[PDB]
């Protein structure tokens, strides 16, 4: 059934699973027209498909051409997402296919279930967790590949860099969701925290800076402070 805080450790067991987040699939800017009407302009999007145990991220770039001449784009985007996740599963060797796919938004359940009819033993589940995967486009290297794309493309990343050499998956996921929540809540301040110190760099082959164990503790504290700070600003507390 649904995935929540009671079964949170299930994310890090040895059953292959993927999170699918469709927030950034259909992305638009809204603007006035010459006649004073309003029009949307789509920009490139992405499906965020993540293995929370290993950090493997399957980033399918959704190029604006897929919307050309299509109607009801917000509805179509869910079905396109499900089509692409199903195609990914079919592309994976049997021993790599997930046993569960957890969608971050309940409107993805029926599209994904219908596209995965051929896989009756893959469970399609919602979650009660509020996950900040919409902020993936605040990770500079992910945003850059999406916006530079001129055609549909799949790009593979490890969203944990090399952290699993030193920490468990549970801790890596907790660090990831804290970083993404902070970038979602105050992007400018989060990036300031992550880069403020020029002597800590992002390796060419990484997404995040090369912090020591002690520096990650400091960074995580500053991210928690940011989130609390913004909550106080928001609610006047």
């Amino acid at each position: 059934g649904a995935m929540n805080s009671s079964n949170y450790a299930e994310l890090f067991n040895n059953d292959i699973k993927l999170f699918v987040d469709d927030t950034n699939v259909y992305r638009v800017t809204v603007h006035k027209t010459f006649e004073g009407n309003v029009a949307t302009k789509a920009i490139n999007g992405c499906i965020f498909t993540l293995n929370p145990k290993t950090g493997h991220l399957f980033l399918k770039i959704i190029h604006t051409s897929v919307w050309a001449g299509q109607k009801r784009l917000s509805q179509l985007a869910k079905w396109k997402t499900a089509e692409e996740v199903s195609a990914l599963v079919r592309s994976l060797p049997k021993e790599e296919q997930p046993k569960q796919i957890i969608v971050t938004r309940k409107a993805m359940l029926d599209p994904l279930e219908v596209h995965m009819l051929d896989f009756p033993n893959i469970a399609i589940r919602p979650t009660e967790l509020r996950l900040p995967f919409s902020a993936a486009m605040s990770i500079d290297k992910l945003s850059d590949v999406v916006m530079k794309a001129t055609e549909p493309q799949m790009v593979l990343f490890n969203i944990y860099d090399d952290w699993l050499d030193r920490i468990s998956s549970y801790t890596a996921f907790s660090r990831l969701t804290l970083l993404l929540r902070a970038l979602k809540t105050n992007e400018e301040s989060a990036k300031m925290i992550l880069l403020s110190d020029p002597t800590i760099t992002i390796k060419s082959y990484h997404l995040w800076p090369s912090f020591t164990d002690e520096q990650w503790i400091t960074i995580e504290s500053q991210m928690r402070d940011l989130i609390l700070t913004e909550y106080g600003r928001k609610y006047n507390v």
Binding site: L76, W79, E83, D110, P111, E113, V114, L117
Partner: protein, 300 residues
């Protein structure tokens, strides 16, 4: 006009014959039902006074044989039986008519209700949904499960309605996932009408039989089937103009006949609100929408 005689009535029981019903007292001199209109299927149904558990009954057509009811004190129910000796069947019935021990099927002449509820229902199709080939009549009760219910347990005692499942490979062509899920026309017209039922009349017949089993026995799987068959049509963008015309008449008389006090359990809010107000066919069911809004405005 034909006659369903009763050897006796040893236990107090409410007897239904189609949409009519009457109460028989324990050991009352009741010996059956006369003047049953030829040309339709019929259903004779029972609810025991001392145990309202198991509504049960028999679908039959007097054109196919001579049928009588005898209470079985071992199995504790009124059983339908076929009399193969015609001359004896006429004489015992005659005697019971002469002694005026039969109720008359109380049909008003202006009244087309039963025809309107059974227009497409044929005995031969009932006997394929309800499988007991040694009898010409079909037993149904409140607790019988459907084949689809059993898939989600005695297969001999099941209702073999046609399985409808909107999230199944049968309903969804590979490569047409969104199309077929949002517009069930493929599933309705190719899989169900052209493929399985062969024509709209057989589809309607099963829909009407499902409703009648839901209404007369409180059979829950029959209610599920009735709503699924409605939903499949209403959720199709492309339906032969005439078929929605006929759907509206069928549903109007079903809603008209439903007991007002059973609406909470016999009507699915989601299906009806979707069919009348959101579906492709939201504007094609004018008569049904009008009776639903005037009779059950709470459901909506």
């Amino acid at each position: 006009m034909n006659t369903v005689p009763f050897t006796s009535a040893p236990i107090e029981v409410t007897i239904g014959i189609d949409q009519y019903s009457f109460n028989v007292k324990e050991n009352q001199p009741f010996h059956g039902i006369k003047d049953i209109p030829i040309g339709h299927v019929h259903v004779i149904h029972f609810q025991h006074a001392d145990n309202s558990s198991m509504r049960y009954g028999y679908w039959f057509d007097c054109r196919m044989g001579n049928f009588y009811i005898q209470y079985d004190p071992k199995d504790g129910l009124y059983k339908m039986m076929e009399e193969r000796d015609g001359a004896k069947f006429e004489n015992i019935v005659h005697n019971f008519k002469e002694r005026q021990m039969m109720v008359s099927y109380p049909k008003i002449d202006e009244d087309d209700t039963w025809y309107n509820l059974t227009e497409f229902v044929q005995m031969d199709k009932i006997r394929k949904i309800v499988r007991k080939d040694e009898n010409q009549f079909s037993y149904v009760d409140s607790s019988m499960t459907t084949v689809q219910e059993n898939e989600l347990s005695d297969p001999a005692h099941s209702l073999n309605y046609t399985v409808i499942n909107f999230k199944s490979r049968e309903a969804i062509r590979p490569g047409h996932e969104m199309e077929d899920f949002l517009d069930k026309s493929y599933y309705l017209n190719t899989v169900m009408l052209q493929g399985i039922f062969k024509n709209s009349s057989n589809y309607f017949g099963e829909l009407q039989f499902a409703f009648l089993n839901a209404m007369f026995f409180g059979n829950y799987g029959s209610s599920l089937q009735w709503h699924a068959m409605i939903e499949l049509i209403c959720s199709s963008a492309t339906v032969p103009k005439h078929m929605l015309d006929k759907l509206d008449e069928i549903l109007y008389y079903q809603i008209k006949t439903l007991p007002e006090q059973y609406s909470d359990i016999l009507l699915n809010e989601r299906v009806w609100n979707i069919c009348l107000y959101s579906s492709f066919q939201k504007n094609s069911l004018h008569n049904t929408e009008k009776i639903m809004e005037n009779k059950y405005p709470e459901l909506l």
